[PDB]
Every structure is written in structure tokens, then in C-alpha cells.
Curated annotation (Swiss-Prot), chain A:
GO terms for biological process: cytoplasmic translation; negative regulation of translation; ribosomal small subunit assembly; translation. The lineage of its organism: Bacteria, Pseudomonadati, Pseudomonadota, Gammaproteobacteria, Enterobacterales. It comes from Escherichia coli (strain K12). One of its GO terms (cellular component) is ribosome. This is Small ribosomal subunit protein uS7. The keyword Nucleotidyltransferase does not apply. One of the primary rRNA binding proteins, it binds directly to 16S rRNA where it nucleates assembly of the head domain of the 30S subunit. Is located at the subunit interface close to the decoding center, where it has been shown to contact mRNA. Has been shown to contact tRNA in both the P and E sites; it probably blocks exit of the E site tRNA. Protein S7 is also a translational repressor protein; it regulates the expression of the str operon members to different degrees by binding to its mRNA.
Curated annotation (Swiss-Prot), chain B:
This is Large ribosomal subunit protein bL31. The keyword RNA-binding applies. One of its GO terms (cellular component) is cytosolic large ribosomal subunit. The keyword Transport does not apply. It comes from Escherichia coli (strain K12). Keywords: Acetylation, Metal-binding, Ribonucleoprotein, Ribosomal protein, RNA-binding, rRNA-binding, Zinc.
Swiss-Prot record, chain C:
One of its GO terms (cellular component) is cytoplasm. Signal peptide: none annotated. It comes from the Bacteria. Keywords: Ribonucleoprotein, Ribosomal protein, RNA-binding, rRNA-binding, tRNA-binding. This is Small ribosomal subunit protein uS13. Coiled coil: none annotated. Changing residue 104 to H: In PW095; partially suppresses a rimM deletion. Residues 93-114 are annotated as: Disordered.
Length: 151, 66, 114
RNA sequence: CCAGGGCUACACACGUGCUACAAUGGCGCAUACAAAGAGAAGCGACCUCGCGAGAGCAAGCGGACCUCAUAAAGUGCGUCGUAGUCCGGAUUGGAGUCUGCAACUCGACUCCAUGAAGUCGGAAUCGCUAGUAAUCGUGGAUCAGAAUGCCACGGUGAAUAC
RNA sequence: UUGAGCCUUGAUGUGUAGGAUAGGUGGGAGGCUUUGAAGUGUGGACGCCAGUCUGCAUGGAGCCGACCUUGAAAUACCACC
RNA sequence: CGCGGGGUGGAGCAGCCUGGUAGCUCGUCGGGCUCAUAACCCGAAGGUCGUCGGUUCAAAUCCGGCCCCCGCAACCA
RNA sequence: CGGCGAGUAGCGCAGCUUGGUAGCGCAACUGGUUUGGGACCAGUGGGUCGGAGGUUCGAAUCCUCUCUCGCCGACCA
């Protein structure tokens, strides 16, 4: 805001295996404060992906992040007259946090049966970076590189 | 008739639920299994059901009861 | 099958398959299959002919698809030719159970065409 | 002063809500954890009857003890398998219960049947910075009866702020 | 200066399979060399810069045929273009 | 009666020569943007090229025909 | 007068040629934006072809007939 530069929160780690980055991921999947429902989806989709990936849970998960983790994104800043889009570097705490959002909205558009099957399909084909979740990351890099003239 | 332009018109057996098992010739293919037939349809009682339209003042006597 | 005149669903359990007949919902269909001695979790494809027949006389105890529609429509026509209040709102086409018409009642009045 | 009628009309337009369009869900069964508050021409156990709303019989309680009063989301197990579909519940028909002198205009609720629009919403636009938004139920006042409103209470519980 | 025709040493056009800057088929399956070799250094030229080439001459009397996988035959000699 | 040329999403233009590897401009939609409109950047939907035959390991381009529009010069029943 | 040429949504214009379903802009209406109006954004409605009669399976279209309004000339002694 105007005045306060507030420090961030204190997330407790994931109960299955202690990881705040997975613990942040179940919050973005959560709806209506139903956390036990969302944890049910995450664990059932991480185990059915860890069979398909071969790698165990977290390292199978975090490799699917860098294909959707961006590095630059546009912002609409005005300094002179009319306003245009400047590409800015994404700070690292936001950088994977923006990646987790793009996954769970891509999995919600998926026309599969359950959310566990949907998210595991989206998290797997992003490890082979063919999903629409990476296509969000490719299209934010296209309009950033179309606007590379502003820095 | 002309040959080879008509459907396979063979003799099948039709068995209804009322017990009327009948032998016909049709192109079903074989062994039609029915539910109702001519001597199974309620054309003698079931046609008269809403013909009995019921009363309205007896419903009052089913509520006044006195 | 052909339960009470129509009934061709398949792949459904018999409590839900029986509800295709105009005149039976979820609780009347449970009363049918309890009185027929049929489990509710069976499909119609796995029904033997020795089970379809004992539903047909079972469903025949309740007024269903054929003679139900002429019963309901006559009772509406009993009201509409009576000139009573409910019959009068049935004529113009407007809600009859005493509910508002200033802003709502799109169901009775159809879409807002002009 | 009185009775009956109107304030509830209905080609339409707007505001504020409620419930939805489903699978992070529906239904079936089993089962766990609240806070706050009300109660005497009132709250009403248990028992019995009724599918049910309820009825009969009726203890107890002016109350940390009695009653309203089984919290629900949750969790287990089963089923449904993406369909206008076991989604949604409008509307309408029939049969009822209760309140009240009285329920036609014009009450709430139950039962059976019906099962519409709706598959996330144009231009626009609103709220919210943490136990908050969202979501889940509970209570109260007014009140013979009649709230999705209002005022309260707790359950689960985020995202983001350069 | 310079096209355009013309004489002639000399030169040209890897999709892929997969060694192959090779035009089409072959003739014929060996040219070749001590009237001093394969491999190389480079001046370059050419270039889908993929890749082949030649000259003072180093090296300096041996390189290599269909074999290899090829839809094809190997400026190893080749005709006409 | 003869020389070559142009015909390409709804609308207009390249790549034809040196063969393979159909692109743009607008208008339509979807985003981002803004107090709003315009503008602007990203992505998408719409044609297999006027029609008929050829060859090659592959053609929407090349080979002729055939049709329409040409731009001309030609033309004494 | 004769010859030609028009009549199409409230207004101004296409479609007619070459027969099956009439568009275009403005205006109107509804919503939005604003304190309000205008402007601007969305949305949406409206005609059934001047009239009459033929032809046709079928007419805004093709014929004919009047009607209305344009344009041309109605001349020589």
C-alpha cells in the first residue's frame, strides 16, 4: 500500500512431507476454506504422477514448475504521456507462486473426470512442457520479448 | 414378388407376458419377446378408468364424516 | 424394457431407471422394487425376464404415464371451467399458488419478450 | 364504529439478496468436534402413534442443573461417470398438518407426483488486508402463525500487496 | 567497356537413407604410377558457409573396383551434353 | 485471328524466376491496456490458391490445355 | 403531351438486371457510463417493397395498368 511494507506470513509445512512450497500449493488449490478436500486432491495426484514420472513426489513436482515458472512479465507503467507495457523481472518468491496459480487454473479447465486426474495430467504434461499451463508461460514471454524495447 | 430386393421375411415366435404365445412371420430376426398382446391389453377394464371421473360431494362426506 | 408403456433406459440402477415413467420418483420407485423383491443396485440389462414381469404388475398399482396425464389435465380443466380463482389464473397464465407477480413469475409467464 | 376488500395487482425497467448451473460434487450409510442465546397465558423431555409435517400422554424448568438441541461443512465406505444427466429445484396437480374466530383473495410446513429456466453469465460493476475474504451451520429479536431480511454466534479457513 | 552467339582446356545442381557440392543411364567392374605416391601447409576461390577443388611446393614410387547402409551409380577412366 | 501478363481467408498484397520449409495488411472475435473511447502489443478463427490432365522419392509454384478479366498492337465474305 | 426513370423500415440510400430468404446508415427502444444531459459503449426491435391485375409451382424482381414525383422536348414556316 502507501505506507506499510509488511513482512509475509508463516505457513506451516505440509503434513505428508514437510515442504512449504507444496504447502503453498494446496492453498492455491483450496476453495471455500476446505483444506482437507484440497489436500486429498494434491496427495492423490502427486502419487499417481510419481508412478508415471518414476521420480518420487516432490522432485517429480518441482521439475514441473520450471516449465511454467516465468522469468519476465509485463506491467503497465506510465512515465511520460500514454501508458505502455514494460517487461520486468519477476522476484523469486512471486516467481514460483505465479507458476502454481497457472497450473491450477489450467487443471480446472481440463475436461477430465476428477480434479486428481485433471491436475496430475496437467502437472505431468508440463514436465514434458506440452500443456496449456506452459502455453501461458510462453505467451507471457512473447509479449515481454515483443516489448523488450522498454527497460 | 421380385427376388432379392425384399427383406428376410421369416417365421418367428412371439411370447407375451399373459401367456399368449403366437407364431407369426416377420423381419425381427427371431424370437420376439413381448410384454402385452391382444388378450393381454386392458382394453376391457383399463379404458374405463378415467371414464370413472369420481364425485366431489362424496369427498365432502369423506371430510364432514357426519 | 417396456415397463408401464415406455421404459427404455439402460446402464442405470433400477431405482433411477424406473423414474423415467411419468408418475414415479425416487421414493415411489423404492416402494416398487421393495415390493418386487429386487435389489436397487441392479442394472436393467442384468434383469432376467422373471424380474421384469413382476415389476409390470407392481407398477400397475399406481396411476402412471398414460392415465395420469389425462387425470391431471382434467383436474386443471375442472378448475378452468369452474371459473374459480385458481382456474382463472390457469386461463391467463400466471402463478396460482398465491405468489408475487410484480417482478417475478417468469416460469408461468415465459420470457420477457417486449 | 363496523363488515368485506386492498396494502400481495402485472405488458415491463431497476436495486438488494437467495438457490443454482455440479465430480473440490450429488445421493446412501456410519461417525467426530462448537460457541452464543431464549424459555411460564412459555420452553417442552421421555414414551406411544403417524412415511412425514405432527398428535396424544406428559416429567422438568423462571433455569451453569430442565427443555428448545441430533451443529453442519468434516471424516470413512459405497454408488453415480460428465450427461441438462442420480445436476438444478422452479412451477403445477393431488393428499395433509399446525396456528388462528377464520388460510378464497393472501400463511408456513409435510407427503406423493411433476421436474422448467439454467452448462459460469455483454457493456459494465461491487466487497475484502487475517482469523479477514470465502464457506458451513446455530441462535435471537419482532411474533398466535408467517423471513432467503436484520442482529448476533461459532466451525473450517485462504490468496495478495512490487 | 561490353553483351550475345560460338571454338575449347576447365567447370555444374548434399530431400532422405545416411561416408558421399554426383545431370540422366551405363560402358564396363578397375583405372593408377617411378618422362618421381596416400596423407598435408596454404594463397585463395566457392558456399543452403553443408562442404569439395586445384597451384610455388613440403611430403615425395603408391593411392585404390562395385564392398558399407543406397531410391542411384562413384570427374578411379568414361561418352555426349 | 496472336504476343507475353494478372486470377491467392470477408476484403487487398508478397514469396513465381533459383521447385519441397502458404506468409502479411485490414476487418471480425479473445486477452492485456485506460477514468472511458481511440490507438497499441500477444494469441486465435477463417482459404489447400478460377477449373481440367502430366511427371517425380514430395507440388499450393513448373508443363500444357480450358474459362474470365485484360493491356495492347492486328483484322477487306 | 411522349420517353425515360424512379417509388423499398421514421428519413436517406442498396437489392431488381439474371425469380425462391430485402439490406445500409441515421433515428428509435433497453441497459451501461456521469451529479445529470450530450457523446461514447453494449444490446434489440421495426418493413415485407406506391397501388392493381396478370404470368409462374412461386413475383421486391418478369409483364401490363393506372397513381405519385423527377428528367428530356412539345420544333420549321
Amino acid at each position: 500500500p502507501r505506507r506499510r511494507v509488511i513482512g509475509q506470513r508463516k505457513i506451516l509445512p505440509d503434513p505428508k512431507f514437510g515442504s512449504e512450497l507444496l504447502a503453498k500449493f494446496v492453498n492455491i488449490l483450496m476453495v471455500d476454506g476446505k483444506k482437507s478436500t484440497a489436500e486429498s486432491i494434491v496427495y492423490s495426484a502427486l502419487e499417481t504422477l510419481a508412478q508415471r514420472s518414476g521420480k518420487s513426489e516432490l522432485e517429480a513436482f518441482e521439475v514441473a514448475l520450471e516449465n511454467v515458472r516465468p522469468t519476465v512479465e509485463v506491467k503497465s507503467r506510465r512515465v511520460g504521456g500514454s501508458t505502455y507495457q514494460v517487461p520486468v523481472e519477476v522476484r523469486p518468491v512471486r516467481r514460483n507462486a505465479l507458476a502454481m496459480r497457472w497450473i491450477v487454473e489450467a487443471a480446472r479447465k481440463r475436461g477430465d473426470k476428477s480434479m486428481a486426474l485433471r491436475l496430475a495430467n496437467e502437472l505431468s504434461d508440463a514436465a514434458e512442457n506440452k500443456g496449456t499451463a506452459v502455453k501461458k508461460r510462453e505467451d507471457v514471454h512473447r509479449m515481454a520479448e515483443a516489448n523488450k524495447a522498454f527497460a | 414378388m421380385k427376388k432379392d430386393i425384399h427383406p428376410k421375411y421369416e417365421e418367428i415366435t412371439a411370447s407375451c407376458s399373459c401367456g399368449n404365445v403366437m407364431k407369426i412371420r416377420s423381419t425381427v430376426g427371431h424370437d420376439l419377446n413381448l410384454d402385452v398382446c391382444s388378450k393381454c391389453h386392458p382394453f376391457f377394464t383399463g379404458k374405463q378408468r378415467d371414464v370413472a371421473t369420481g364425485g366431489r360431494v362424496d369427498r365432502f362426506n369423506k371430510r364432514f364424516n357426519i | 424394457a417396456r415397463i408401464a408403456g415406455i421404459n427404455i433406459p439402460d446402464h442405470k440402477h433400477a431405482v433411477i431407471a424406473l423414474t423415467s415413467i411419468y408418475g414415479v420418483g425416487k421414493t415411489r420407485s423404492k416402494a416398487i422394487l421393495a415390493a418386487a423383491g429386487i435389489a436397487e443396485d441392479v442394472k436393467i440389462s442384468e434383469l432376467s425376464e422373471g424380474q421384469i414381469d413382476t415389476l409390470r404388475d407392481e407398477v400397475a398399482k399406481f396411476v402412471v404415464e398414460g392415465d395420469l396425464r389425462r387425470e391431471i389435465s382434467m383436474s386443471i380443466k375442472r378448475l378452468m371451467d369452474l371459473g374459480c380463482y385458481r382456474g382463472l389464473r390457469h386461463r391467463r397464465g400466471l402463478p396460482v399458488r398465491g405468489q408475487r407477480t410484480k417482478t417475478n413469475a417468469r416460469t408461468r409467464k415465459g420470457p420477457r419478450k417486449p
